[PDB]
Paper text:
Here, the structure of the novel tetracycline antibiotic TP-6076, bound to both the Acinetobacter drug efflux pump AdeJ and the ribosome from Acinetobacter baumannii, using single-particle cryo-electron microscopy (cryo-EM), is elucidated.
Using three metrics for classification, the AdeJ–TP-6076 complex was determined to consist of binding, access, and extrusion protomers. An extra density was observed in the binding protomer of AdeJ deep within the periplasmic cleft. The binding of TP-6076 is largely stabilized by both aromatic and hydrophobic interactions. Additionally, V139 and F611 interact with the trifluoromethyl group of ring D, while G179, V613, and F277 participate in alkyl-alkyl and π-alkyl interactions with the diethylamino group on ring A. A326, Y327, and F629 are also engaged in alkyl-alkyl and π-alkyl interactions with the pyrrolidine group of ring D. Electrostatic interactions between Q87 and Q176 and the carboxamide group on ring A of the tetracycline core further stabilize TP-6076 binding to the distal pocket of AdeJ. As Mg2+ is known to coordinate with tetracyclines in the ribosome, it is somewhat surprising that no Mg2+ ions were found to bind the TP-6076 drug in the AdeJ–TP-6076 structure.
Author numbering:
A (entry chain B): 675 to 722
B (entry chain A): 579 to 1047
C (entry chain C): 723 to 770
D (entry chain C): 98 to 337
E (entry chain A): 50 to 193
F (entry chain A): 242 to 481
G (entry chain B): 50 to 97
The structure:
Amino acid sequence: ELGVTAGFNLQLKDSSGQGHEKLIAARNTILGLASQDKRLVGVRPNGQ
Amino acid sequence: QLPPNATLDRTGKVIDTMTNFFMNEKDTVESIFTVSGFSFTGVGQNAGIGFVKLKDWSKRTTPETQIGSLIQRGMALNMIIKDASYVMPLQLPAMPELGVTAGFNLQLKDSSGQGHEKLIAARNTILGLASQDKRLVGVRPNGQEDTPQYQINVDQAQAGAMGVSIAEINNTMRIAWGGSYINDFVDRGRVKKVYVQGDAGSRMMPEDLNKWYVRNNKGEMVPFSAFATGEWTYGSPRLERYNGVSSVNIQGTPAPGVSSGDAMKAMEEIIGKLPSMGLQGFDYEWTGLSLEERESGAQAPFLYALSLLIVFLCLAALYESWSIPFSVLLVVPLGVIGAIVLTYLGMIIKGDPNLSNNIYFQVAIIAVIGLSAKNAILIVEFAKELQEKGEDLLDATLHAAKMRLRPIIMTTLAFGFGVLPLALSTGAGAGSQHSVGFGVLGGVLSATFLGIFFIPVFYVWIRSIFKYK
Amino acid sequence: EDTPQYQINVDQAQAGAMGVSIAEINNTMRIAWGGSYINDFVDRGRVK
Amino acid sequence: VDPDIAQVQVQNKLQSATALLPEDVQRQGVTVTKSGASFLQVIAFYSPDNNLSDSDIKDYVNSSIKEPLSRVAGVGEVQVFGGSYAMRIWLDPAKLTSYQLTPSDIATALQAQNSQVAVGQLGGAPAVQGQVLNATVNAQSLLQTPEQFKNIFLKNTASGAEVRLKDVARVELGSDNYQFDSKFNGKPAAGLAIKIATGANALDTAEAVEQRLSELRKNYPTGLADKLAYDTTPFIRLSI
Amino acid sequence: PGASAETVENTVTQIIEQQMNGLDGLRYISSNSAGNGQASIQLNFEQGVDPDIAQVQVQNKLQSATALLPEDVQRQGVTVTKSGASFLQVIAFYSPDNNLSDSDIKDYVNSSIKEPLSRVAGVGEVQVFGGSYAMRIWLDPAKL
Amino acid sequence: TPEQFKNIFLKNTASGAEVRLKDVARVELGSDNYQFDSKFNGKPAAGLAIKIATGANALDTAEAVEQRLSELRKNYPTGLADKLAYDTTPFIRLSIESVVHTLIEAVILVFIVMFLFLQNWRATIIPTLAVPVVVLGTFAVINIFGFSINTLTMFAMVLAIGLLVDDAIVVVENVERVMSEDHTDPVTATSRSMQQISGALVGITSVLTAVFVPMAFFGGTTGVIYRQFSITLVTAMVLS
Amino acid sequence: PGASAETVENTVTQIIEQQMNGLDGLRYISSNSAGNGQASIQLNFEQG
Ligand SMILES: CCN(CC)[C@@H]1C(O)=C(C(N)=O)C(=O)[C@@]2(O)C(O)=C3C(=O)c4c(O)cc([C@@H]5CCCN5)c(C(F)(F)F)c4C[C@H]3C[C@@H]12
């Protein structure tokens, strides 16, 4: 019943209506620091 | 509520006179939120509502800072604000789940089928009679009132000749005088709506219709005036039905010292005068909280009877007699006397409409019966044992009473001290606590000062008639 | 049980020379022989 | 399987086929019902003296008797085999050819003419400053009589003469369906069936229907009688 | 639409009202027909009746009734809701220093604060007292 | 944007001039609804009124509403504030707390009655120790059957304190007497005392459980209220 | 059919989720709109 695959799931949610290109920009900043952080392993964007 | 056909602007002027009053009642009032155009009864430009939050219960201990003191001062608004039909401040119901506002709700049903006009005539007799009863405050019709309407009649024949479709006129006049949602645009990532309607100056008055034109099949422009005409008419804005029959809802409140049942009985008497006055064929039904009030009072006689029976049968099975259960049942009136007596005196001395026969009083009476029975068993169980062991009835009954007295008083007094806190409650929920307390406490007092004496006497009487063994 | 039935056979080419359109022919018959419900009206407070 | 749950599942699935249904089928409407109680009794409303037609009585039961009987205690469902009147326009093929008209034209003239206009309100929500009155504008524009239907405009002749619906057709108030003939005892008739409600005493529901009927017979149109064509209550009374 | 309180009553109200008479556990019915064309029917059931199952029952009664409705009524849709009696809370949104406008405030409560609260556990109904921005085109009759 | 709606193309006139939307109308960003004017403290405001779903705790729903709002406030525009104009939950808590104050007060008052009669700390303590067990246990049993803590259940617990100490009182009152009469040891008296006391104990329990049992069977809203008192009372008496 | 992901989000998905309020037991709603013209809205409810 669960497709999470034991991975923390984070839903970056644009609540202020910045836009899709801005939402993507934010995601990119988040994925950089995560790769740098030793605790976090294999944090990957889910969609396309 | 404002007069019929009122504008939103006129309603907002009244809600401002109302808001100034509450905002100036500083000791008892903290806030107000108001909506013009919204009402529980209906949405119209004439309707309005206000939600007032009083100050903390701590800051409101004086009589002036009480809830009913506010409501009575705010009832002067009806006289102050001339324009509005009514401005009525209303408390919430005890259980707000079961209602919007406290008071009574009734439906006048046109059971005969006489009319809509006849029905409103009946409402208005009931309304003036209720104005003149001092057991009632704020009787009002609930619902919309008859209003002047604007009727446009379109000549189908001339429409056909000019060559304008009646279907097309509807399209031109539905978008012009009312609005039309056509499609959706995106604002900040969110779909909104696009509306087309005419400007306000074009849709304000009957003469403004003449400003609009409808295209024919030849493609020409034909004035609305050419095919239609308007007359001012009078009619009902909304029709109400209760259980398959046409009705009117009447809602009101009891006067300051009167109970809900009393106001309910006053209204039913007023409706009784309807036939004598000349409007007959009218019937009524109770609804909401009032229905329920009626139903709860009804079930009480059956409740009391069934409870008495279960005690009687259980006692027989336990004690293998028929005579002794009767002796214990006979002493029961003695406890119930104190319960009713404290409640009635208390109401008179305390001036409290809340101290009346209610659901809470009924639970108390059940408790008193159990207490009286419990007190009677202790003296009587021991008496039968001694008789079974050869003691003569009088001696055995007497011995029992001495042996069981200290136990009986001690238990009876502890049940009494337990309900003293309910009886003397000053906080939120006090009224309910008092209803239970006084009834229980009275019964305790009567049981201790009259019942104890009666328990030996009835047993001796029954046992003498039906001798043991 | 199966029963005799009748079929109309429309020639598009004879009709074409005449000018007539197929859906015009089709529409005529639907209303004529078949019947059509246009819209509602009110009689004595009941819509029929 | 719980009946109510089964019916609601079916209706919900049905909501996904409607767009794909022919306009006409959609216009009539599609219904979903469920199995259940048997009929306690069928009452036949018939005209002994042949005064009333079937169409007339089915219409009377529909507009008069159906609803009062439904409110009677214990009655879960009231069914009438039958329907009300319909306005009927019968078209002469020859009269249409004479004025160069086709059935479709008559249809187009009948959609436009018979419409309900909706306007709005005088005051209006975003109103002008200084508006004192708000009312409701309503337009009566629908047609209720046969004559209104015959005067409907169609065309103007070369002479300038007027051709209306009366010229090319016969307009009458007639039956909605002509498919069935119903009679009781050789006399025109209509039938109403009663279904008992859940958790009910049929014997008591039956008595209640009898008494309601008693009140409505007084206001009957001339020539109507009511009798029972089916009753199951005798069985149950006898069995108890 | 376009219909009087008397036509809304005989055409829609009573026809819907008769279908629901046999429903299990129905304490009473109250109905309203209005001059704007709106009809409303409230059904009260007896204690003991599950509200979820009662909702599935009314809807099952209404599928047949909708047929007998007038066509323009069916077109506008018929709504069935589980209904509550009183507001638990009324929340006010406002500007203290008037550094924000009401059209802006009203828009933010309809676009940002209403759906999440309507989706808060136990919430049920949510009514808004302000409006949202819409594109408004106001026509001049003469120029048209 | 509204400019794009002003440039909508509508028609061309004979001259060949283009007619755009601006020519026939005024375009503006306005409102979906113009029906209601809401104010807070006499000043413009918007409002959200919440009507709780059936089958839910108001208290719990309120906390959730506020918790969601706490997260929402962080993304607020600069001007926005929020206050509760109408809240009913505060009274509910104060009502719940008042009754708990009353319960504590009653227990203390009962202790004193017993002490005035018993006159020994040792005697008084035994009946008193019953109260924690009886009340805690009753709360337990009732939650097994889905009864919450409410004013009605709580009133029943207050009503029961004088009632549930009875069996205990009727036991120690006697052991104590037995001893002053026979000068026997605490254990001998207790065993003797328990033989004389048992007929009385069963009888008092029976009467007090039986008066409260018919209430639960009654239906309707009144029945819902009655069963709060009767489950609590009956559980308490058996436990005692 | 034939729609862009953007067209399915504006025209279809947002319109539907706006009506999705007032549901007993709703833990969360997750949605997707794609280039193949398809929209999927998934609603997850709490236990019981
Ligand atoms: C509206 C046109 N039409 C109206 C004629 C009805 C309609 O077409 C529908 C549909 N499609 O829904 C049907 O229900 C129907 O076709 C049908 O099933 C019938 C029966 O079977 C039936 C029966 O079983 C027992 C009796 C009783 C039992 C006791 C004495 N006789 C009668 C009755 F005599 F009362 F009329 C009927 C009539 C028809 C109605 C049909």
